[PDB]
Enzyme design. Sequence first.
Site, PDB file in Angstrom:
ATOM      1  N   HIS A  77      22.233  11.767 -26.633  1.00  0.00           N
ATOM      2  CA  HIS A  77      22.787  12.247 -25.340  1.00  0.00           C
ATOM      3  C   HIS A  77      24.398  12.213 -25.587  1.00  0.00           C
ATOM      4  O   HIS A  77      25.187  12.398 -24.389  1.00  0.00           O
ATOM      5  CB  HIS A  77      22.553  11.502 -24.227  1.00  0.00           C
ATOM      6  CG  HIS A  77      21.305  11.589 -23.725  1.00  0.00           C
ATOM      7  ND1 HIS A  77      20.038  11.418 -24.452  1.00  0.00           N
ATOM      8  CD2 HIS A  77      20.769  11.867 -22.477  1.00  0.00           C
ATOM      9  CE1 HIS A  77      18.929  11.492 -23.487  1.00  0.00           C
ATOM     10  NE2 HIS A  77      19.337  11.699 -22.784  1.00  0.00           N
ATOM     11  N   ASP A  97      22.446  19.530 -27.823  1.00  0.00           N
ATOM     12  CA  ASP A  97      21.747  18.410 -27.178  1.00  0.00           C
ATOM     13  C   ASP A  97      20.388  18.571 -26.938  1.00  0.00           C
ATOM     14  O   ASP A  97      19.799  19.573 -26.463  1.00  0.00           O
ATOM     15  CB  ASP A  97      22.685  17.881 -26.173  1.00  0.00           C
ATOM     16  CG  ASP A  97      22.632  16.472 -25.792  1.00  0.00           C
ATOM     17  OD1 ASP A  97      21.584  15.808 -25.607  1.00  0.00           O
ATOM     18  OD2 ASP A  97      23.529  15.687 -26.017  1.00  0.00           O
ATOM     19  N   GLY A  98      19.581  17.366 -27.045  1.00  0.00           N
ATOM     20  CA  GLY A  98      18.312  17.381 -26.720  1.00  0.00           C
ATOM     21  C   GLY A  98      18.290  17.467 -25.144  1.00  0.00           C
ATOM     22  O   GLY A  98      17.283  18.045 -24.698  1.00  0.00           O
ATOM     23  N   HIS A  99      19.247  17.112 -24.437  1.00  0.00           N
ATOM     24  CA  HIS A  99      19.381  17.398 -22.868  1.00  0.00           C
ATOM     25  C   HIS A  99      20.585  18.270 -22.631  1.00  0.00           C
ATOM     26  O   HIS A  99      21.908  17.715 -22.724  1.00  0.00           O
ATOM     27  CB  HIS A  99      19.558  15.968 -22.114  1.00  0.00           C
ATOM     28  CG  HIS A  99      19.449  15.775 -20.743  1.00  0.00           C
ATOM     29  ND1 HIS A  99      19.909  16.841 -20.048  1.00  0.00           N
ATOM     30  CD2 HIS A  99      18.527  15.017 -20.055  1.00  0.00           C
ATOM     31  CE1 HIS A  99      19.471  16.584 -18.613  1.00  0.00           C
ATOM     32  NE2 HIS A  99      18.762  15.705 -18.771  1.00  0.00           N
ATOM     33  N   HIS A 139      10.556  19.116 -19.598  1.00  0.00           N
ATOM     34  CA  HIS A 139      11.430  18.344 -18.671  1.00  0.00           C
ATOM     35  C   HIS A 139      12.258  19.055 -17.773  1.00  0.00           C
ATOM     36  O   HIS A 139      13.032  20.007 -18.077  1.00  0.00           O
ATOM     37  CB  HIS A 139      12.253  17.335 -19.580  1.00  0.00           C
ATOM     38  CG  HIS A 139      12.921  16.464 -18.878  1.00  0.00           C
ATOM     39  ND1 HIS A 139      14.198  16.622 -17.773  1.00  0.00           N
ATOM     40  CD2 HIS A 139      12.715  15.025 -18.590  1.00  0.00           C
ATOM     41  CE1 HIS A 139      14.611  15.457 -17.495  1.00  0.00           C
ATOM     42  NE2 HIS A 139      13.514  14.531 -17.787  1.00  0.00           N
ATOM     43  N   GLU A 167       8.115  14.228 -17.209  1.00  0.00           N
ATOM     44  CA  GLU A 167       8.687  14.366 -16.065  1.00  0.00           C
ATOM     45  C   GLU A 167       8.847  16.013 -16.067  1.00  0.00           C
ATOM     46  O   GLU A 167      10.058  16.330 -15.944  1.00  0.00           O
ATOM     47  CB  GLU A 167      10.115  13.745 -16.141  1.00  0.00           C
ATOM     48  CG  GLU A 167      10.088  12.180 -16.298  1.00  0.00           C
ATOM     49  CD  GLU A 167      11.303  11.674 -16.545  1.00  0.00           C
ATOM     50  OE1 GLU A 167      11.727  10.752 -15.596  1.00  0.00           O
ATOM     51  OE2 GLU A 167      12.130  12.092 -17.302  1.00  0.00           O
ATOM     52  N   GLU A 171      10.780  14.722  -9.432  1.00  0.00           N
ATOM     53  CA  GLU A 171      12.450  14.023  -9.533  1.00  0.00           C
ATOM     54  C   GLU A 171      13.494  14.603  -8.599  1.00  0.00           C
ATOM     55  O   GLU A 171      13.849  15.706  -8.539  1.00  0.00           O
ATOM     56  CB  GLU A 171      12.661  14.198 -11.006  1.00  0.00           C
ATOM     57  CG  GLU A 171      13.819  13.047 -11.084  1.00  0.00           C
ATOM     58  CD  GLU A 171      14.172  13.085 -12.893  1.00  0.00           C
ATOM     59  OE1 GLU A 171      15.305  12.747 -13.048  1.00  0.00           O
ATOM     60  OE2 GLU A 171      13.414  13.472 -13.627  1.00  0.00           O
ATOM     61  N   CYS A 185      16.628  14.320  -9.030  1.00  0.00           N
ATOM     62  CA  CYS A 185      17.523  15.138  -9.854  1.00  0.00           C
ATOM     63  C   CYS A 185      16.954  16.323 -10.159  1.00  0.00           C
ATOM     64  O   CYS A 185      18.017  17.393 -10.390  1.00  0.00           O
ATOM     65  CB  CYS A 185      17.913  14.325 -11.272  1.00  0.00           C
ATOM     66  SG  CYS A 185      18.942  13.036 -10.777  1.00  0.00           S
ATOM     67  N   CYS A 203      18.218   8.692 -13.359  1.00  0.00           N
ATOM     68  CA  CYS A 203      18.405   9.569 -12.069  1.00  0.00           C
ATOM     69  C   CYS A 203      19.174   8.509 -11.146  1.00  0.00           C
ATOM     70  O   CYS A 203      18.481   8.042 -10.145  1.00  0.00           O
ATOM     71  CB  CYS A 203      17.446  10.344 -11.506  1.00  0.00           C
ATOM     72  SG  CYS A 203      17.931  11.389 -10.170  1.00  0.00           S
ATOM     73  N   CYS A 204      20.431   8.232 -11.309  1.00  0.00           N
ATOM     74  CA  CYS A 204      20.966   7.077 -10.903  1.00  0.00           C
ATOM     75  C   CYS A 204      21.700   7.695  -9.379  1.00  0.00           C
ATOM     76  O   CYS A 204      21.478   8.890  -9.102  1.00  0.00           O
ATOM     77  CB  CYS A 204      22.337   6.521 -11.419  1.00  0.00           C
ATOM     78  SG  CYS A 204      23.318   7.680 -12.179  1.00  0.00           S
TER      79      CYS A 204
END
Lengths: 637, 637
Positions: free
Chosen positions: A128, A178-180, A254, A306, A322, A324, A401-402
């Site tokens: 990340h 990025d992977g995300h 995802h 997810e 989710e 987010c 997912c704060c």
Amino acid sequence: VATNVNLKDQFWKRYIDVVRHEVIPYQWEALNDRIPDAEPSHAIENFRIAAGESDGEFYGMVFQDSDVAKWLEAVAYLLETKRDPELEKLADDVIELLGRAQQPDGYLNTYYTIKEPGKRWMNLRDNHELYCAGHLIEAAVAYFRATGKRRFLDIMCKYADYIGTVFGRGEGQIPGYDGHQEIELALLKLYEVTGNENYLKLSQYFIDQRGQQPYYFDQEKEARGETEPFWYDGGYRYHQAHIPVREQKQAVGHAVRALYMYTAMAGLAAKMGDESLKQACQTLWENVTKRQMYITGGVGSSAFGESFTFDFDLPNDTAYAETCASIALVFWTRRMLELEMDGKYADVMERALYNGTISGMDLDGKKFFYVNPLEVWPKACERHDKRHVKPVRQKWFSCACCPPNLARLIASIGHYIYLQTSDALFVHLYVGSDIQTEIDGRSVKIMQETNYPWDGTVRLTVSPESAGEFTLGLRIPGWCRGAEVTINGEKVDIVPLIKKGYAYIRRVWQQGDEVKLYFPMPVERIKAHPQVRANAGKVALQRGPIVYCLEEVDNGPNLANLFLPRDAKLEAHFEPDLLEGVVVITGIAERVDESAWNDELYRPIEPRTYKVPFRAIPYYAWCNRGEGEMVVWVNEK
Amino acid sequence: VATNVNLKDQFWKRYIDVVRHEVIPYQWEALNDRIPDAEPSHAIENFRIAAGESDGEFYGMVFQDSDVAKWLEAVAYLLETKRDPELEKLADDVIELLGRAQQPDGYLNTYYTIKEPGKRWMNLRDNHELYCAGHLIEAAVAYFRATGKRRFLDIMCKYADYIGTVFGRGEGQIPGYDGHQEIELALLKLYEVTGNENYLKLSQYFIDQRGQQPYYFDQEKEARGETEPFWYDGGYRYHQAHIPVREQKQAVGHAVRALYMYTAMAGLAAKMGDESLKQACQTLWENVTKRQMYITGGVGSSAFGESFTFDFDLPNDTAYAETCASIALVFWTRRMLELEMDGKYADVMERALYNGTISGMDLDGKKFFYVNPLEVWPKACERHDKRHVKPVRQKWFSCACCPPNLARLIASIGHYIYLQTSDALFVHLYVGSDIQTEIDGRSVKIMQETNYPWDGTVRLTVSPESAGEFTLGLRIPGWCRGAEVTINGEKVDIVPLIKKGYAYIRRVWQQGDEVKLYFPMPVERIKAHPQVRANAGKVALQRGPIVYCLEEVDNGPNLANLFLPRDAKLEAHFEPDLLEGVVVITGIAERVDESAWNDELYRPIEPRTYKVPFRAIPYYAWCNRGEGEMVVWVNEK
């Protein structure tokens, strides 16, 4: 553009008040490890250590730095509604600390500065770096737009410029990504606030490179001597890196990741006027919103990964949805509207905002859900296939997912209401507010007053510095039939003026001109496409943009055996003192008698039924009155 | 004493021939590593090595030894209904091989002979030692009763005596028991055939010790130096070893293990006259069969742990309903009947026999299911939470469950049809058969002729050598609405003769006396108790003991979009050439027309429906005509 938007309503204003007084202050304590109950964050401490102001080891998840950014981003948006010196001071201090933790080349990442230094950029698939960078950029851009202070933006431009040297297809660069996803949509906003084309090109590069063969993630993987298979059965579908984005037609993998990627694709399609990106967005849009989206605006049907599954697979009890992901959906819809003005994007934006987004938090902001199910039997949540579903909201670890995620969306709600194009002012959302802006260089104030979502009357007031011709674009909500418009008490036939769900009203506008919109809000019985197997024989209640649910606290247990007859008479009314003030729906339903059942499990005995009243509340407002069963999709007749 | 049952059927005798010509010969080839594509079993070869007749390494699962036992057991029962000198010569060779692999003290276990010699009894929680011994004991008892050859019995009696010295209370004994119940029921049968009461007391010991504190599994765990916690979140609930069996009131844990345990418990309640176990058994019986059993006789609702969940949690799509768990249910009911003569036990036996046991195999016996779902959407079997549901049957290489498990039950079906007491011949199952036996001294032959389960008419001929008084107890099926009985054409008023689901007909019987029974078999619409959430608004079709299902090959895709009106015009007729000759149910259903959605997902519309004919077939017979959707519980209109 010279634009400015203020909120003047009850519904969103309450949420912002809660983010300001509860959510952000609490999150600041947790980020600083000052909550003795809680599991430690170490998020600010990681930066102090990286800055050489504190001894210790790195602690947390690999993307812990992103917590701080999202808090800062929410704080930036709070500073736009109420300028608040204590807040501005803590943020400025965090920003200076960030400046000191940044390496001279511009690299800013605590995990690699403290714990694995020199091993940077070696695990893009998992660690990340670019995702944390992106959230940091978004925070600086918002902090700049809010306060006019550019320290944070200078710090982040330096990181962006460095990332721009490392990554690419030229000599000595890494053809990685990025992977995300996230850096791509963040780079767009940096471009939009700096004018620096390099950031546009960098965003374009990351999008264009994704999914290209040979897979960059196989190359970095092999270089790390790693042979174990990736845990997700669908492989790089998880990261939407299986094929190039222009060839992606099905939402896979995802959900937050996909939606961050599509948001970036849509913003790039707009900037470049590139049809291939635009048509990929549009096809993915149809797939998501017409095949893989819950009625709450929820997305993601599988706890495992997810993730998205496949068309029409929208189970209610094992849903993931989710918070987010629903937030990411909002981000996407806004870029979709900037790419092509179609009411259906704002329809979905509104669906997510008034349902599967704010459902993620208690009314008072003290607790949160990660997962947003459409059906709960609390006992069944002990099952393995449902353990991801927590039947009551809670406080959360460095989860991913704060709560600052929901916080930054809520505090920026004002940015999603209107869009100003040179010729035309567009109204996307029906929210008590005003906007001071420029159209044809003409200074204009527009004001909306409305009790929406609780009622569908909107009074828009249009006050230009001097009378002038321009276009007002009013979204016609897709849930509504029979929208009516008047201008100074005069009916306006909107049917010849509507183009893809917006009514284009072009005339000479004068000081005080009043546009009254009426969107009838009957109680509606919603039915899902017959291919949605989960909802065969079921109905959902909706009124305006708000989806309703039944809870055990009002209706008792075993909601599966509450049936709603097709021509029961339904009634809605406002309850000022319930769940901060909601419209509730009531009527007469039927329950199946259990008493005739005589310690037997299976019998040829047709049900005996009896009338009971039911009460339905807004989906977002569920789980504020104790643990119990809840359903959205109710059995019919 | 001497008692002989021969099947004179089509239904069950066809399953027996499939087991004799396809299943048992194939399994022999696999156990002997003579199948060039298949994953090697090495089950026989492990014994050759342990016997010092071959060099090599142990291969397979820790319970690999029980695979051989189960084949020998099935073979024993095949030899009862048709003696085959070649098969028998084969079994004898294998038996002598077991003789030579046995350690000098009687211990017979290949893993703990060739791979970990000296380390036996160190992991009773996981390593299936007593489980394999129990299966071997069952094969030996069976083989003796079938052939008269005592050799296998001498071998296993020696192992059984050895186990008697190792396990119990006191010094030089282990206060332990197996993680997988089995040895307890097997020891009852060993007692039954040998008269040696140490075997009975050994069974009692294992049952009485289970779940005492301090936990035996905790002690061996600490001695193994293992400290990371058990994978199943319910801990020793998985093994039903969480509390003593006499305090267990709900079925929990792995379903096969639970049911093998309850079977022994019922056996011991009868053999010891133990009221505490009898009560416990009745309580558990009511819990399983009134709250945690599928309409098919399937038990086990969670793939995680292949386990019971809790009352009324019976999802159709994520069901486990392992073939071996319904089988185990059959063993339990047969013991329950020897303990309390109530038609409810035989009702459930019949349920499981005609639905969720034989559903585990293709009609030609070449492929098998481990899991027996009540609803299939093949595409959705790709979801992680449904990946345990295979949408077609297959060959199974590692197992634990399947083919010799089903084979042994099918091959021994004749043993479940009647029960001989002193006074009384009980008829539990309506199966074309005859039985020669001894009643109050007298030689008596009884002949059943019937087309059951397809028809409810039965003819029993009673032919005692000389005329005499005895009781014929006839089960009145719980699914039937009335029964009519005549003896030699004259009517019997049976209501005064019915006690707990059996009609007691006591009279002087004479040669050629003819009992005719009539059970009406209408098409029934079955409802689940309202607490079964999964089936709110759904209905299942049943005729006689057979539960029906709808398949895509007859009805088209999207079986969720099929609604059964209040009058569905239900007819039944026999199709002699379909699926081995079955009764099909036909009728009219309704489907929703999709076009009113205009490819939208959610809409407030009044759906237009249309009429279609439908065809239903026996559940057991599903998945013999290609991959496709299947549903047992259909939506009601």
